[PDB]
């Protein structure tokens, strides 16, 4: 079966990586406002 230790350890990383992502998501949300999506239409 092979002990999937990496699986359990990987779950713990997501908790931290996700927390660090949400912290930066706030600033990124603003930056997007500077560019703003605008493509031609018909």
The DSSP result for 1-42, as a single string, is ----HHHHHHHHHHHHHHHHHHHHHHHHHHHHHHH-------
Cα–Cα dist 24/10, whole Å: 21
Distances (CA, A) of 42 to 4, 18, 19, 34, 37: 53, 40, 41, 25, 16
Q: The tokens of 30 are what?
A: 């603003």
Q: The tokens of 8 are what?
A: 């359990």
13-9-28 Cα angle (round to 5): 10
Q: How many C-beta atoms lie closer than 10 Å to residue 12's C-beta?
A: 9
Method by which the coordinates were obtained: NMR
What is the homologous superfamily of the domain 1-42 according to CATH? Answer: Moricin domain (1.20.5.750)
29-32-33 Cα angle (round to 5): 95
Distances (CA, A) of 41 to 26, 38: 30, 9
């Amino acid at each position: 079966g092979k002990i999937p230790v990496k699986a359990i350890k990987q779950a713990g990383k997501v908790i931290g990586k996700g927390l660090r992502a949400i912290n930066i998501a706030g600033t990124t949300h603003d930056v997007v406002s500077f560019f703003r999506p605008k493509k031609k239409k018909h």
